[PDB]
Amino acid sequence: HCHRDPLPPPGLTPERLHARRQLYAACAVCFVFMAGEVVGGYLAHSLAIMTDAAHLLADVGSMMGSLFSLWLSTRPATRTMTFGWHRSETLGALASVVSLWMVTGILLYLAFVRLLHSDYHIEGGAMLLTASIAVCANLLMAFVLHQATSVRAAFVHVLGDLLQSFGVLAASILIYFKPQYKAADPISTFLFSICALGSTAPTLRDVLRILMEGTPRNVGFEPVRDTLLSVPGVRATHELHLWALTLTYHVASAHLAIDSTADPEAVLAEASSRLYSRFGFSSCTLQVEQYQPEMAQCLRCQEPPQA
Amino acid sequence: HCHRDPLPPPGLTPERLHARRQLYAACAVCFVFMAGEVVGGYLAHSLAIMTDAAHLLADVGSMMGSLFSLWLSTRPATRTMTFGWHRSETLGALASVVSLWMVTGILLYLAFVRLLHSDYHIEGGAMLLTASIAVCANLLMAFVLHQATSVRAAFVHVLGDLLQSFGVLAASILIYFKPQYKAADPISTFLFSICALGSTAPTLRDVLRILMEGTPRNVGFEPVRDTLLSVPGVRATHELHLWALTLTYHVASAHLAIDSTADPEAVLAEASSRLYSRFGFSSCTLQVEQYQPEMAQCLRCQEPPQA
Ligand SMILES: CCCCCCCCCCC(CCCCCCCCCC)(CO[C@@H]1O[C@H](CO)[C@@H](O[C@H]2O[C@H](CO)[C@@H](O)[C@H](O)[C@H]2O)[C@H](O)[C@H]1O)CO[C@@H]1O[C@H](CO)[C@@H](O[C@H]2O[C@H](CO)[C@@H](O)[C@H](O)[C@H]2O)[C@H](O)[C@H]1O
Ligand SMILES: CCCCCCCCCCC(CCCCCCCCCC)(CO[C@@H]1O[C@H](CO)[C@@H](O[C@H]2O[C@H](CO)[C@@H](O)[C@H](O)[C@H]2O)[C@H](O)[C@H]1O)CO[C@@H]1O[C@H](CO)[C@@H](O[C@H]2O[C@H](CO)[C@@H](O)[C@H](O)[C@H]2O)[C@H](O)[C@H]1O
Ligand SMILES: [Zn+2]
Ligand SMILES: [Zn+2]
Ligand SMILES: [Zn+2]
Ligand SMILES: [Zn+2]
Ligand SMILES: [Zn+2]
């Protein structure tokens, strides 16, 4: 019996309720911070504060996408969505990356327009006050996280947020005391936007690899092929497909050409057990064929060449 | 021998060279049209001409994505991309939709800013000349396409382009003779942007359905399940997965629980032939299991409920 070795846990686990509560609290806090920073930066006509608020918007969007994916990954698979709704997490990550690129591009264009035909005034007091408030808020968030895995990830993320806020505060301090240095705002916007795009590049690469039906990063083609070929009875392998619904949901398929004096049920059971134990594939479908002498002659029955 | 029934055609077909040439010519013509219209609209400070140029940019991006996908869908499958590069077409369609949304949103914001605090001047002569040039170019393109499938699709697309250009020309004519009606430009921008978003919605829906690993639109769950269950020997079915790499590349997988007094090779061959003939699946992997009495009791061995 395929898929009968494990069991599906129904209902909502108590730890998942805690995770949902933490995500709700983090989303509320980050949204309040983003709204306050947007108001302050608009009052100060500052673009660095726009960059910080855009980063907070990216954080909020990522957490909201995570919450939406968590809610979606509980409905049963339908007749139109056979695999379930696990791809929603990847789609939400892609949406967050795209939105970050949009806002960063808008901010970069605004900063570039500011730099040449430098016609803008920046309120030093308002910008300094907003930057100080943002730095204090980041420090308070870091202290709360230290007092209270996901918490450690939030702690390091808040430390990075705090470093960026310190940079913005330094720029605001420079502008406030020396009003002639208004150019520190577009320059800081440029630096932080480039940093944001560089930070978002790896997630975009991973999302694209998942979406293009590529092999999962951790799972290797050669280890899986060698595991399948090591099963007693298997002679060859073709049409070995490995892809991931998300970072944790991996699917596998293959055609196994077994010997004539082999038991297809035993081969199938052993191969499924080996794949599940070694690689933890959520789904695995193996087509047990018979190794005809013509199998080793078909062009399409040949594995991809070594990289 | 599963997958040995068809044959793979190598090289480049003569008709594909012609298709590439047509795509190159169309991209060149649309890019020249877009550049001319951008120059004219910028000279005229018009936003309707920006909307038409944005539509031309969307057309150019879609054709360029099609060309890139056509070039990519010739490399052999690697060890990191087992299925090939067919998902590139869907990714390019999604990218074109996202870019269209970006430009449309920018134009909509500009038009909204124009409408309230109406501080802008529109050169009637330049806008009228650009609109007349665009209408004449669309008419010439339609005539050329009529003189010379893909050509008919281009013809109807150019007819729609020509209708939009006629609307822009009517707005320009109204503005030129009556300069007090500058509001006709933001209003036209709004109408055409809403039309563009409404037109782009269905493609976004289809792309999302493909990317979320959903069932292909044409292929139905029940017909495939009934085809599989009609094979002499099959007693049940579970883990039936149907999804599409693109609009034309469909993949299928299933676990077949056959009778004890059945031949797995014959069942597999018959099921593969039936699926290929009826639905034309590019890839098909079927796991032929043995129908234990406990199969009809497992929760995970049950098909999704009827919609
Ligand atoms: C009492 C209440 C407690 C609530 C706790 C809530 C915790 C849940 C949210 C935690 C959170 C948001 C923080 C929001 C602000 C803080 C909240 C403010 C609260 C104020 C009260 C922190 O996520 C941060 O993400 C960064 C990048 O996003 C990452 O940094 C990175 O670069 C660094 C460069 O130096 C480097 O050092 C570091 O190693 C890198 O990983 C940080 O390490 C990580 O901390 C995001 O949670 C999750 O974290 C995952 C880790 O990756 C993140 O990535 C996953 O998916 C990726 C693709 O899907 C995939 O690519 C990843 O492999 C995968 O893992 C998830 O997407 C995200 O959902
Ligand atoms: C001598 C040189 C000849 C060169 C010929 C080049 C031909 C190749 C390009 C032709 C082309 C660009 C035209 C560019 C400007 C014209 C060129 C100017 C040349 C000047 C010399 C015309 O594509 C147009 O696309 C429109 C929507 O995009 C579509 O309209 C639609 O709504 C109408 C609402 O009323 C309605 O009526 C109509 O029924 C609808 O379909 C039009 O019917 C269709 O004509 C696009 O080609 C292909 O067309 C496919 C058809 O759909 C299009 O969709 C495919 O994929 C979709 C998701 O991937 C999926 O959703 C579709 O199901 C699928 O089919 C492809 O994406 C595209 O790649
Ligand atoms: Zn942050
Ligand atoms: Zn073969
Ligand atoms: Zn067009
Ligand atoms: Zn099965
Ligand atoms: Zn079962």
From Swiss-Prot, chains A, B:
GO terms for molecular function: antiporter activity; metal ion binding; zinc ion transmembrane transporter activity. The chain crosses the membrane at residues 23-43, 53-73, 93-113, 125-145, 155-175, 184-204. This is Probable proton-coupled zinc antiporter SLC30A3. Zn(2+) binds at H55, D59, H157, D161. It is a multi-pass membrane protein. PANTHER family: CATION EFFLUX PROTEIN/ ZINC TRANSPORTER, PROTON-COUPLED ZINC ANTIPORTER SLC30A3-RELATED. There is a cross-link at Y291 (Dityrosine (Tyr-Tyr) (interchain with Y-357)). Changing R217C: May be associated with increased risk for febrile seizures; decreased zinc transport; decreased localization to synaptic vesicles. Keywords: Antiport, Cytoplasmic vesicle, Endosome, Ion transport, Lysosome, Membrane, Metal-binding, Synapse, Synaptosome, Transmembrane, Transmembrane helix, Transport, Zinc, Zinc transport. Residues 44-52, 114-124, 176-183 are lumenal. Probable proton-coupled zinc ion antiporter mediating the import of zinc from cytoplasm into synaptic vesicles and participating to cellular zinc ion homeostasis in the brain.
